[PDB]
Amino acid sequence: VRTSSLGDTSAGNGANASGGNGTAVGGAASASGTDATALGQASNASGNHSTALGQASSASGSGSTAVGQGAGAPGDGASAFGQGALASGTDSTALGAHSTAAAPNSAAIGANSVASAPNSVSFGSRGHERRLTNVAPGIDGTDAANMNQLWGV
Amino acid sequence: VRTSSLGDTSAGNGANASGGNGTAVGGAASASGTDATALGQASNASGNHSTALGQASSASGSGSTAVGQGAGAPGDGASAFGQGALASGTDSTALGAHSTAAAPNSAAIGANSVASAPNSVSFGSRGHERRLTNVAPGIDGTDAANMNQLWGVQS
Amino acid sequence: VRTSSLGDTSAGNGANASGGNGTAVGGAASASGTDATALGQASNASGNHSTALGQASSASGSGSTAVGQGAGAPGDGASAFGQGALASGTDSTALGAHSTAAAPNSAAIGANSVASAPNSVSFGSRGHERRLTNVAPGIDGTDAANMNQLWGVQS
Ligand SMILES: [Cl-]
Ligand SMILES: [Cl-]
Ligand SMILES: [Cl-]
Ligand SMILES: [Cl-]
Ligand SMILES: [Cl-]
Ligand SMILES: [Cl-]
Ligand SMILES: [Cl-]
Ligand SMILES: [Cl-]
Ligand SMILES: [Cl-]
Ligand SMILES: [Cl-]
Ligand SMILES: [Cl-]
Ligand SMILES: [Cl-]
Ligand SMILES: [Zn+2]
Ligand SMILES: [Zn+2]
Ligand SMILES: [Zn+2]
Ligand SMILES: [Zn+2]
Ligand SMILES: [Zn+2]
Ligand SMILES: [Zn+2]
Ligand SMILES: [Zn+2]
Ligand SMILES: [Zn+2]
Ligand SMILES: [Zn+2]
Ligand SMILES: [Zn+2]
């Protein structure tokens, strides 16, 4: 257990928290961004205010978060949750194992989901679409419409 | 590495797991709730069964989870994922950097999304709506309708 | 802090990382899968490429991730976020406290949400539906229709 006078803490062979208020726990775990936190062997939180939790996880974007083995978040404001998830667009969010949020301000929801269009939320990919269930009827213009509502027309 | 007979583990300058089965790792990391887990400098898992992971992350609600630097989950049953995400409503869920789910039983999906109505899931905020894609056609009454179904009705 | 020549790290009474590139931190924390990461007392990352973070969390599925106190991911490709969240279906994703993504290829979004139909995404459960808000109008056949669009047909 190695500590610094600037709030860094590390543990594991070759683990290095050098950014200030850093935490790096795991073999060759690295937290080089300010306010950065890395957990798992070869985890890498190099972005400022980044968080990389999971073996070979990586969060190199500013304000990025990658959680799950081999998860990646290279976009600024990008967040990836799930083993092998990638959030690579600016302000993107990938939630699901092997999900990919590639476009800016996009989200990909579910395992293997891909978001390749700006400002959109993807629940799968072409030929692998998912039904959205337990949706209460929409009220405002920008609420989703459910089947009971479509049928009422 | 400090350990107690009651399942607590602490590592870091001033790191303190004191709640029973606590784990606190990072400078001034604090796990004071029962079964609490805190990782990162100044991380604070103070709710019973809370989990705060990331620098300055905070999970003070009972059963709360905050993952991401500066993430916060002060609501009971609340879960926040993303840097600066905030799940402040009871049973709220905020998934995306700087997302906010303030209302009870709500969810905010995507960066900067705001959920301020109860029992609702927001995919953005007013003037910043997001489109929902790769949606299979709705089958049951409470499923979403897609554009293909809307077009077949416009006939 | 114990370390192996095969990249394992463990800290805590009875902590054990034995799979290769493993990390196990906390009282009786266990990381037995390859490339596995466990944080918290009794946390258990026994799947290959699994990640279990939170007191008593479990990720026993291959490539599974469980984050939150008592969160569970026994399914292959399963990801659970939130206290007591369970993603048990193959390729399922449970996001929210006490959410359950049970069916293969399903997702449960929101506290207490249940997904029991394959290839579907649930925002609640029967009699506990949630409104989806801040949805831009759909463009492609497989985009969700919003209310403005529905009303544009109604006339
Ligand atoms: Cl940066
Ligand atoms: Cl953007
Ligand atoms: Cl696609
Ligand atoms: Cl202790
Ligand atoms: Cl002891
Ligand atoms: Cl509490
Ligand atoms: Cl910021
Ligand atoms: Cl409510
Ligand atoms: Cl396995
Ligand atoms: Cl894989
Ligand atoms: Cl399926
Ligand atoms: Cl089309
Ligand atoms: Zn800061
Ligand atoms: Zn930020
Ligand atoms: Zn296929
Ligand atoms: Zn307990
Ligand atoms: Zn609970
Ligand atoms: Zn604006
Ligand atoms: Zn591997
Ligand atoms: Zn995988
Ligand atoms: Zn799978
Ligand atoms: Zn009920």
Side-chain angles (χ1 to χ4, degrees), chain C residues 5-117:
Chain C
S5 56
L6 300 158
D8 304 294
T9 311
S10 59
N13 280 339
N16 194 29
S18 64
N21 295 336
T23 311
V25 177
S30 172
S32 70
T34 60
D35 297 351
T37 302
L39 171 73
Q41 194 280 331
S43 60
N44 175 55
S46 63
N48 291 337
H49 310 97
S50 65
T51 303
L53 317 173
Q55 193 275 335
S57 54
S58 180
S60 65
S62 193
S64 63
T65 302
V67 171
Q69 189 282 332
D76 294 344
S79 310
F81 181 71
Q83 192 263 323
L86 176 72
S88 57
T90 298
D91 284 338
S92 69
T93 306
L95 302 168
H98 304 281
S99 59
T100 303
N105 207 42
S106 66
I109 306 305
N112 305 119
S113 290
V114 184
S116 58

Side-chain angles (χ1 to χ4, degrees), chain B residues 30-125 127-140:
Chain B
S30 174
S32 63
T34 64
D35 296 340
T37 303
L39 175 75
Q41 196 279 331
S43 57
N44 193 351
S46 69
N48 298 328
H49 315 98
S50 63
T51 303
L53 316 174
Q55 191 278 328
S57 66
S58 187
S60 50
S62 156
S64 65
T65 305
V67 174
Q69 188 281 334
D76 295 347
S79 313
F81 180 72
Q83 191 268 321
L86 177 67
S88 50
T90 296
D91 296 319
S92 67
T93 310
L95 311 169
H98 295 276
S99 62
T100 303
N105 213 37
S106 68
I109 306 291
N112 304 116
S113 299
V114 173
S116 60
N119 302 305
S120 63
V121 184
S122 177
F123 301 86
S125 59
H128 296 264
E129 301 86 352
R130 277 186 186 96
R131 179 175 54 108
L132 311 186
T133 70
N134 296 303
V135 175
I139 293 174
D140 290 317

Side-chain angles (χ1 to χ4, degrees), chain A residues 2-144:
Chain A
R2 180 205 143 290
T3 61
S4 90
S5 63
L6 276 196
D8 304 298
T9 309
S10 56
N13 287 338
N16 177 203
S18 60
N21 296 331
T23 308
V25 178
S30 177
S32 62
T34 60
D35 295 341
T37 302
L39 175 77
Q41 194 281 329
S43 57
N44 183 27
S46 57
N48 289 338
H49 311 94
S50 64
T51 309
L53 311 176
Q55 196 282 322
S57 61
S58 176
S60 61
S62 193
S64 67
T65 304
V67 172
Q69 187 281 327
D76 305 329
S79 319
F81 178 72
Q83 190 262 318
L86 175 73
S88 64
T90 304
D91 290 337
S92 62
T93 307
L95 310 174
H98 308 301
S99 59
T100 301
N105 217 35
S106 65
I109 308 303
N112 300 300
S113 287
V114 177
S116 55
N119 214 30
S120 70
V121 180
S122 172
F123 299 93
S125 67
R126 280 176 57 82
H128 298 79
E129 298 88 7
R130 288 194 186 83
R131 218 195 329 141
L132 310 177
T133 73
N134 300 310
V135 169
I139 296 172
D140 296 313
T142 60
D143 291 354

